[PDB]
Amino acid sequence: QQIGTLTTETHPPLTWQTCTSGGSCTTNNGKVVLDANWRWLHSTSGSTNCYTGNTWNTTLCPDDTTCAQNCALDGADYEGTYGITASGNSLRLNFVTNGSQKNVGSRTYLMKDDTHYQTFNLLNQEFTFDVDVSGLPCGLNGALYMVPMAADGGVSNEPNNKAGAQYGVGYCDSQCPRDLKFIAGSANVQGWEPASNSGLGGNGSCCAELDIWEANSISAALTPHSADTVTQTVCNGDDCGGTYSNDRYSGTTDPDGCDFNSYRQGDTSFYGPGKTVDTNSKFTVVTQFLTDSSGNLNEIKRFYVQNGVVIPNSQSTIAGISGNSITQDYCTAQKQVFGDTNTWEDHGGFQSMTNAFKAGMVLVMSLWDDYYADMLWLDSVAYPTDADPSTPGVARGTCSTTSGVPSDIESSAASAYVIYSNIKVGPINSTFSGT
Numbered sequence: 001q002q003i004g005t006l007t008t009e010t011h012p013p014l015t016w017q018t019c020t021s022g023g024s025c026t027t028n029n030g031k032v033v034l035d036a037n038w039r040w041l042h043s044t045s046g047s048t049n050c051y052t053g054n055t056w057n058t059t060l061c062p063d064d065t066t067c068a069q070n071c072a073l074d075g076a077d078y079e080g081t082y083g084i085t086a087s088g089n090s091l092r093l094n095f096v097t098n099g100s101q102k103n104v105g106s107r108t109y110l111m112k113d114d115t116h117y118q119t120f121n122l123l124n125q126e127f128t129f130d131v132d133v134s135g136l137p138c139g140l141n142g143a144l145y146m147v148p149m150a151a152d153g154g155v156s157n158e159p160n161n162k163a164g165a166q167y168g169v170g171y172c173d174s175q176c177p178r179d180l181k182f183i184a185g186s187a188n189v190q191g192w193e194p195a196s197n198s199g200l201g202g203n204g205s206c207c208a209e210l211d212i213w214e215a216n217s218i219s220a221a222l223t224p225h226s227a228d229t230v231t232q233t234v235c236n237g238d239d240c241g242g243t244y245s246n247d248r249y250s251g252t253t254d255p256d257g258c259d260f261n262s263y264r265q266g267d268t269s270f271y272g273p274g275k276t277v278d279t280n281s282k283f284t285v286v287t288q289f290l291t292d293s294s295g296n297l298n299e300i301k302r303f304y305v306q307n308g309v310v311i312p313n314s315q316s317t318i319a320g321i322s323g324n325s326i327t328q329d330y331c332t333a334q335k336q337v338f339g340d341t342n343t344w345e346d347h348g349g350f351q352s353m354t355n356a357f358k359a360g361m362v363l364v365m366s367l368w369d370d371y372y373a374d375m376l377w378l379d380s381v382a383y384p385t386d387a388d389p390s391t392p393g394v395a396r397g398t399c400s401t402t403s404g405v406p407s408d409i410e411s412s413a414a415s416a417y418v419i420y421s422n423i424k425v426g427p428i429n430s431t432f433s434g435t
């Protein structure tokens with residue numbers, strides 16, 4: 001994609017902290033950038049749309065390459081159009097914004113400078129942030145996560161990609177998404193078809209994915225996802241696997257991940273409104289990436305801090321699945337007991353995530369509803385909706401099986417929002433303390 005020049009692109013500021021072993025921290029003045037899919041895409045010679053609604057202009061975009069040559073991503077009105085406001089240490093994303101057009105959700109990335117994403121290798125480190133999820137009902141997901149996107153947005157070896165990180169180009173994840181308009185410096189117009197549960201193009205954008213945080217006020221999940229190749233690869237149609245494929249597990253990535261949702265793991269009193277981690281108020285989320293003696297990831301721990309109290313992650317209470325952290329033993333046990341295919345292990349598990357960190361992870365902060373499964377996998381009394389909650393792994397939250405339909409919640413929860421704040425990174429136990 002080209003650089004549009006009709007609207008200035010100014011990245012809102014967001015500062016975050018790097019901490020020493022002793023708990024002393026210094027500030028980094030970063031910025032955030034909106035993902036390219038949300039932007040205006042128009043001709044390089046004027047305001048004619050290359051895409052709008054869910055269809056492409058086939059004169060400007062007769063194939064993937066010509067489309068990339070002809071089409072420019074332009075600047076974003078962060079607050080006015082997308083309901084994104086970044087001030088000091090805080091980033092707020094609103095669910096619905098009624099500007100000239102209705103906008104739903106957003107996906108943003110943390111930048112190092114105006115043309116490069118910040119990258120993170122968190123091995124032997126922890127990532128910590130504060131979050132307000134009190135305004136997120138059933139069906140919404142305030143996600144904070146990491147994917148090994150190219151730091152420059154792909155520009156270095158993609159001749160038709162001038163827009164790059166500056167315009168939020170380069171996304172990939174463990175679902176191998178085919179709804180992306182641009183992938184690896186080409187458009188995705190070839191094979192494009194409108195789809196109600198997303199449109200979808202001929203190709204998808206695959207990579208490993210570390211879902212540090214996927215949550216609303218009801219349920220939360222922590223989920224690493226492996227991949228054969230940890231950085232971006234391009235897949236072809238149904239061979240992609242993932243959410244938009246006829247065989248979900250036929251691709252090169254792990255679309256399910258090794259998840260820890262306290263409720264799914266049998267503790268229904270731990271996370272939620274009025275619960276131990278009380279989602280009616282702000283709290284701190286600490287995620288630690290522990291290694292073996294060879295420097296390979298072998299454990300992900302989680303702590304919360306609320307009201308100055310340090311709260312360890314809840315124990316899994318499911319018979320056959322013990323502990324309160326993500327480890328080799330936990331993942332093997334959980335997939336066996338829940339009867340879920342262990343694509344996590346198949347695509348390299350902890351070694352894959354180790355290599356993803358070594359490649360360098362970009363921080364993603366998003367707010368979304370789920371046109372595929374209504375977020376039921378996160379927060380439903382049963383997923384799939386016809387399964388027995390008596391079966392371990394079926395229940396994930398307290399939301400009804402009819403909850404989270406986009407057309408419903410985009411009206412009924414239009415005021416929903418999430419706030420991420422006070423991001424801190426450093427050695428183990430450097431970013432938090434309390435009773």
Ligand SMILES: OC[C@H]1O[C@@H](O[C@H]2[C@H](O)[C@@H](O)[C@H](O)O[C@@H]2CO)[C@H](O)[C@@H](O)[C@@H]1O
Pocket residue numbers: 223243255256257259340372373377378383
């Ligand atoms: O694609 C939707 C959603 O799937 C999540 O994996 C689910 C999986 O769909 C289900 O079959 C299994 O029983 O539970 C897992 C964990 O909830 C995946 O973790 C998400 O990233 C993804 O958005």
Ligand SMILES: *[C@@H]1O[C@H](CO)[C@@H](O)[C@H](O)[C@H]1NC(C)=O
Pocket residue numbers: 043048049057058059060
């Ligand atoms: C598609 O783009 C061409 C070339 O700019 C333009 O002439 C035409 O009006 C566009 N089509 C639509 C439906 O906007």
Ligand SMILES: *[C@@H]1O[C@H](CO)[C@@H](O)[C@H](O)[C@H]1NC(C)=O
Pocket residue numbers: 428429
């Ligand atoms: C970090 O703090 C946790 C919680 O108190 C503790 O279990 C762990 O031993 C500590 N690790 C280090 C390296 O201090």
Ligand SMILES: *[C@H]1O[C@H](CO)[C@@H](O)[C@H](O)[C@@H]1O
Pocket residue numbers: 195196197
């Ligand atoms: C479009 O169709 C899909 C099924 O193909 C539905 O899930 C969605 O609600 C919409 O009607």
Ligand SMILES: [Mg+2]
Pocket residue numbers: 064186187188189190202203
């Ligand atoms: Mg293509």
Ligand SMILES: [Mg+2]
Pocket residue numbers: 134217273279280
């Ligand atoms: Mg509440």
